[model samples]
Target: MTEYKLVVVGAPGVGKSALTIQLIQNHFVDEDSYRKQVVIDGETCLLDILDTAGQEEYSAMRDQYMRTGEGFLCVFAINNTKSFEDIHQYREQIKRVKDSDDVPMVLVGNKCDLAARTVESRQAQDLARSYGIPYIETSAKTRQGVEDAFYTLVREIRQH
Candidate 1:
């Protein structure tokens, strides 16, 4: 079976866990390990998901997993502007550790159910366009677009 080492990263409180847990078990604060068998486009693969979020002391260790993560879900909460602003560095460090220009990634904007969303869909789409990766909007609270976010990474990894 094929294996995709996936990582979920973002500024804290951006609902990284909310999305990650929603995908695997629909289950929160710190790093967690999760795995699930998925079929994408009729090919089954094992997904090893690493969800890492917190302060710098812990985020300093993000590179370690980033090195092994075959694909990444660079997450940000749509309701928060700073979370959206910090994504540039997230994609940067990912490529930095992978030592490649086109590392497989998906720009995920979480908490899309918010009434007062700060990061508009257009901006998120533009950011993903610039990064040359797929963009997905998700409402972890409503379970919208949860599976697509990760499944997109599987396709991204396979494409690259």
Candidate 2:
């Protein structure tokens, strides 16, 4: 088995894999980090999840979090058109900071329930395809594709 730094934990929580990707969890002021252990693709991984979820001013604290991130989830809400477009900004900064072309990343779209129909699935698909990365959609209310989102990251880093 291989080892990665961004994923961790031993004791499983009630919401271990389910609530793991709640959109609410992504609304912090760049706070809260956790460690969880999970088995993915037959490999055991310890995940150091940094829930530095917060305001749009990524420009200010960009390096602090971006520097340590081995893999990334470029998350945007389906109800918000701007959030979807903002993915490009993040993609550019991450590469700029990391100074690399092929960084492990997963494009995530949340608020699938609200479905303002702002950002279509095909839009996300093509973007990920163009970037050569994987894309996953999630809805915290219905709790669909939550664990899979994190799982996708696990797979992404492993490939890198």
Candidate 3:
């Protein structure tokens, strides 16, 4: 199987760990990075998921993960505007770490199951468009749109 490395990065409490758990473990629970094999477009692929779990206090740690990642899921919370805005910093850091503007990335708005949404989908979509990346809204609690986000990221990584 073809293997690819993926990283999940986001603001604190943005559900990065939650989404990673839902995607790999198929349930909501606190956890660390894990690997899973999946089929995408009839190709067997193994994804090595690296979840930062909001430990972004150190620039060296963030840069290390970004540099090793073949694909990235830059997550934010739909209920928080600041989390949404912070996505730009993560993306810029990834670009710098990878030293390429054509990095494979997906912009994700997590916690969509919540009734209170401070960041609109249209606005997130616009920002993703500006960065030339696909935007997906996901809810880790409800397990909605989690697979799509990972699948899209993997496909994009394969292309690159």
Candidate 4:
């Protein structure tokens, strides 16, 4: 049996929920909030995907779940420059919640199809490089790079 724990975290409206919905349910949720799960593999393995609430009001609850995770996928919206600009604070939030420095993390830029509204891929890549994590841009609207982003994060988690 294999057990993997992953937390999807980020500031509100950063597409964290979108990524989770696509990965766990193969569909998008336009209005629903976060959902947690204990996924049973074909036989004995279990994969836990904790979809943390992005709202600041629920930061405590989000942090509580994050402390139990071995890895995280931090999402930021490419169309929202504000979200991209605030990813550093979001990273700090993850650190504050996990209270550790060794957990694996992936920096994701969502809504990549809206490049005209983007802050630029270079900025996001630079931030990911600065933190020594993989950087990937995705657009749930078109399902582009969605699976690869999650697969890459899962693989990284397993590698560590």
Best candidate, lDDT: 3
On the 0 to 100 scale, the lDDT of residue 83 in model 4 is 83
Off by over 4 Å in 4: 30-45
Cα distance off (Å), candidate 2, residue 18: 10
| Local accuracy of candidate 3 as per-residue lDDT tens digits, 1-160 | 7998989889988998888888877889643679888888898888899988685568887887788889999999999999998898888898988999989999999989888899999999999999999999999988989999999998898788
Clashes of each: 0, 13, 0, 1
- What does the lDDT come to for candidate 1? 0.85
lDDT of 2: 0.66
What residue pairs clash in candidate 4, if any at all? 2-45
TM-scores of the models, in the order given? 0.92, 0.78, 0.95, 0.82
Listing every candidate in turn, what is its Cα RMSD in Å to the true structure after a full C-alpha superposition? 2.3, 6.8, 1.5, 3.4
Instruction: Summarize candidate 1's per-residue lDDT along 87-157 as a digit string, tens digits.
Output: 99888888888899999888998888889988889999987888788899998888889989888888888
* lDDT ranking, high to low: 3, 1, 4, 2
Candidate 2 lDDT, tens digit per residue, 42-134? 777677776554453545576677777788766777767777787787788888888998888888777676635688899989999999998
- Report how far off residue 24 is in candidate 3 (Å): 1.7
Task: Return whichever of 1 and 2 wins on lDDT.
Answer: 1
Residue 36, candidate 4: Cα error in Å is 11
Give candidate 1's total backbone clashes.
Answer: 0
Instruction: Answer with 2 or 4, whichever has the higher lDDT.
Output: 4
